[PDB]
Write a protein that binds this ligand. Structure first.
Ligand SMILES: CCCCCCCCCCCCCC(=O)CSCCNC(=O)CCNC(=O)[C@H](O)C(C)(C)COP(=O)(O)OP(=O)(O)OC[C@H]1O[C@@H](n2cnc3c(N)ncnc32)[C@H](O)[C@@H]1OP(=O)(O)O
Ligand SMILES: COc1cccc(COC(=O)c2sc3ccccc3c2OC2CCNCC2)c1
Ligand SMILES: [Cl-]
Ligand SMILES: [Mg+2]
Length: 384
């Protein structure tokens, strides 16, 4: 049963829609009727408006996530998004401070809950809808299974609806009512030895340590020799290349020139974008973001450095060549592992490029939207 989810404008567990259905569950909503009062929290807890632009507020959000955010099923790893990453993720064009919602415990003044949204135009099945992208829902490990999460969700929904937005996109590893797509992740080993010493990867009697190192070795030469860090001048070119590529997919964000500069211009230890320019034209792009995991209870290593495949477009190479280059660029930036979802064209290169299947999948969800579900090849958006 999904006692909370079932009260919400999302599909029931059995709902399945034709490709021709593509619409809200609840249309003709009115901003004027949205509740003005904040949702009621348990006694001794208060809403707090986080200023992601303030170093100190931002560090409180960081601590909460470092200690309490997503772990894998074996709880060896916990996501450790850096402060400077959270600042990029939360301050895209037209972002609203009042969509960055904390909850404090009054007696300690400590942040013990968070939820965020940013505004994004989302094209679902060729209809572009102004939506909210929701992320970084977190409750402190000590406060789990007390029905705080639905209060966080309902408060942000109300804050979102105040801006006349009635749809959202979000992703979770947990299964909820009901995904529009479901994409397994794959991982390409870069620093083999580390990955074995921490348990992520393993050896058979056939595959010895030296043999595993050799298996994953890469040639430090790019397939596209002029692939270079993106610069401000490249923004219009990236806009045209990415914008045109993304139109083939069933689900994707429609990016303005301003969002392209926000989402792609490199920031050390956050976002890496490389371009291939020919006649002042951007004809190829690789991008990936930095998402470390903290390694729980390993005597030797505290952090796994991990590049996450973001948006990759080639017109002068094979997609395999392009991704092979993405892997090398991540190795050049001291990543231990390169992670990708089986979205867009990704899956076609995983065998050849020596990716291993992960343990699970990332589900893609819409709020207050009814449509046909689809295979993840047709997914054209990567969240943070
Ligand atoms: C138009 C605007 C629309 C606005 C909003 C759109 C929707 C946005 C939705 C959010 C999108 C966020 C995307 C995102 O951030 C990326 S997915 C990452 C979520 N964060 C984590 O997993 C961190 C580790 N865990 C936690 O901090 C807690 O376990 C959380 C806070 C997850 C749940 O706290 P708790 O102490 O374990 O649980 P209770 O408080 O007792 O609450 C249980 C109720 O929460 C439902 N639940 C559990 N996990 C969920 C999840 N990941 N999405 C949605 N729902 C989730 C659950 O199914 C149940 O409902 P039910 O009884 O019906 O089954
Ligand atoms: C620490 O636990 C993990 C250990 C190993 C692997 C994972 C992976 O989980 C995910 O959801 C993934 S993979 C991937 C690969 C490329 C691009 C995105 C993602 C992704 O979603 C991201 C976007 C949604 N918000 C969290 C990360 C977890
Ligand atoms: Cl209610
Ligand atoms: Mg709770």
């Amino acid at each position: 049963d999904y006692k909370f989810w079932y009260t919400q404008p999302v599909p029931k567990i059995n709902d399945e829609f034709n490709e021709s259905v593509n619409e809200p569950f609840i249309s003709d909503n009115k901003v004027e009727d949205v509740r003005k009062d904040e949702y009621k929290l348990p006694p001794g807890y208060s809403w707090y408006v986080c200023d992601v632009k303030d170093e100190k507020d931002r560090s409180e959000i960081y601590t909460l996530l470092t200690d309490n955010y997503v772990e894998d099923d074996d709880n060896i790893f916990r996501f450790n998004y850096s402060a400077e990453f959270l600042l990029w993720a939360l301050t895209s064009p037209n972002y609203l401070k009042t969509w960055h919602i904390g909850v404090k415990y009054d007696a300690s003044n400590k942040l013990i809950g968070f939820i965020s949204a940013i505004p994004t135009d989302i094209c679902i099945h060729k209809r572009t809808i102004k939506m909210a992208e929701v992320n970084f829902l977190c409750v402190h490990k000590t406060l789990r299974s007390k029905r705080l999460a639905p209060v966080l969700i309902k408060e942000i929904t109300r804050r979102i609806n105040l801006e006349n937005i009635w749809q959202a996109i979000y992703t979770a590893g947990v299964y909820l009512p009901k995904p529009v797509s479901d994409a397994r992740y794959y991982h390409r080993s870069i620093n083999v030895k580390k990955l074995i010493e921490i348990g992520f990867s393993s050896l058979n009697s056939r595959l010895t340590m030296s043999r595993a190192i050799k298996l994953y070795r890469v040639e430090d030469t790019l397939n596209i020799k002029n692939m270079r860090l993106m610069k401000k001048k490249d923004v219009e070119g990236v806009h045209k290349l990415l914008g045109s590529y993304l139109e083939q997919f069933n689900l994707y964000a429609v990016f303005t020139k301003e969002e392209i500069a926000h989402w792609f211009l490199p920031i050390e230890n956050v976002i890496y974008t490389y371009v291939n320019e020919e006649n002042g034209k951007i004809k190829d792009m690789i991008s990936f973001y930095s998402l470390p995991s903290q390694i729980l209870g390993n005597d030797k290593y505290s952090t796994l450095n991990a590049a996450y495949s973001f948006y990759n477009v080639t017109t002068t190479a094979t997609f395999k060549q392009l991704m092979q280059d993405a892997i090398l660029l991540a190795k050049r930036n001291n990543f231990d592992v390169f992670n990708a979802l089986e979205v867009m064209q990704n899956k076609s290169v995983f065998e050849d490029l020596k990716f291993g299947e992960g343990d699970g999948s990332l589900k893609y969800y819409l709020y207050n939207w009814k449509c046909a579900s689809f295979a993840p090849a047709h997914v054209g958006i990567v969240l943070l």
